[PDB]
């Protein structure tokens, strides 16, 4: 099972604070170290700091500005990183990773996407992308779904509840007037659709939403 669970996203107003959580399962030892790693868009991995939940002791990266104060709840087995006085420079993906005290990170969390903006949360509008009746196919057919006008990042797109992963492409989002937009493409054997159903699932964690859309031919 997934060992480390992090929230998908956190929206923070400029100057405000946020407490990122990491819930641990699997083998738990007194020698377990919880590490936090920062990653800005299109950049590398940056070590923030580490905490040992049994003591409550935290160590911080001295090369960077101390934005973090690390705490831990032992009763709930959850690690907490408190980020304070955030700016646009703090907008990034924050992984939590478990070290067995031997130097390497055996397992990582899914990461928490932190976006610093004054804009308001907006759920995505999902529309079906099915070809016209005049287009021609070969042995394969391409369908899709359009995700428009959402904020903030990210969104997770799957096909047929995850059972359809091959032949799937998800394009990077584009930003316009405080709203993001992307599209997702899927390719299945032309003989299988629409005789067999194809549905795309879009999940926006920031608004705690998840929707499905079935692709049928334009009648």
């Amino acid at each position: 099972q997934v060992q480390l669970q992090q929230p998908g996203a956190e929206l923070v107003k400029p100057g405000a604070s946020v407490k990122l959580s990491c819930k641990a399962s699997g083998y738990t030892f007194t020698s377990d170290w919880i590490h936090w790693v920062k990653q800005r868009p299109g950049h590398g991995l940056e070590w923030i700091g580490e905490i040992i939940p049994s003591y409550g002791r935290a160590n911080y990266n001295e090369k960077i500005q101390k934005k973090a104060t690390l705490t831990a709840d032992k009763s709930s087995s959850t690690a907490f990183m408190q980020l304070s006085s955030l700016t646009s420079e703090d907008s990034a993906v924050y992984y939590c990773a478990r070290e067995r005290g031997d130097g390497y990170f055996a397992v990582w969390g899914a990461g928490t996407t932190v976006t610093v903006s004054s804009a308001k949360t907006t759920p995505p509008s999902v529309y079906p992308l099915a070809p016209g009746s005049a287009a021609q196919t070969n042995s394969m057919v391409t369908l899709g779904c359009l995700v428009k006008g959402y904020f903030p990042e990210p969104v997770t797109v799957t096909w047929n509840s995850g059972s359809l992963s091959s032949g799937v492409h998800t394009f990077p989002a584009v930003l316009q007037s405080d709203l993001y937009t992307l599209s997702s493409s899927v390719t299945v054997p032309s003989s299988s659709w629409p005789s067999e159903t194809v549905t795309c699932n879009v999940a926006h964690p920031a608004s705690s939403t998840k929707v499905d859309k079935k692709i049928v031919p334009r009648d």
Binding site: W47, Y104, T142, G144, L146, F171, Q176, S185
Partner: protein, 212 residues
Amino acid sequence: DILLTQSPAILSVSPGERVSFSCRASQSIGTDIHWYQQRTNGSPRLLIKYASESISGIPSRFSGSGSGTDFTLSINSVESEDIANYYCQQSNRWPFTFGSGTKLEIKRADAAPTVSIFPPSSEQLTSGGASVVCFLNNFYPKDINVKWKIDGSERQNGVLNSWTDQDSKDSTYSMSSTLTLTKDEYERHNSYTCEATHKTSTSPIVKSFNRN
């Protein structure tokens, strides 16, 4: 603080060829180096621990070597799934540090883009919007040009483009071009056209639809 240098930052290689990633530490760190793979929109994954020790679940394809200040991560016969970022990380001295990372590219055979055009959904028209979406999928190399045409006349306004990274499924590239208009603007034109220009063909791959 240990400086980890990963050079070169980008590696391109033909399918089936052997590749080697370099990592040099600012000072001797013994064999206390670890390698992590991170694919697009994913979390890091441990490949090699302590310079050369293999991890269970990781393909025998991956191997590691080196000691002191120089280290090497080797992949024997690269395939499409290996397309990702590769990081090295030392645990010899506090604090732990990461390498700058190295991107892996694959030089596959040229492939023509599969072009698909999609009319606005009725659901979208309901909200007063209308987006025509064109997909240029699975082509190589990544350099490509897309042109929109409305009733035979080229269109550039309302067009937003998005390019994927190299696909870890088949070493190809893909691109989406979305033309967004209001419903009112969309309803007073008939023919919508997407044209893809790529080196794999002298002629443009054209997909069109009439609103009627």
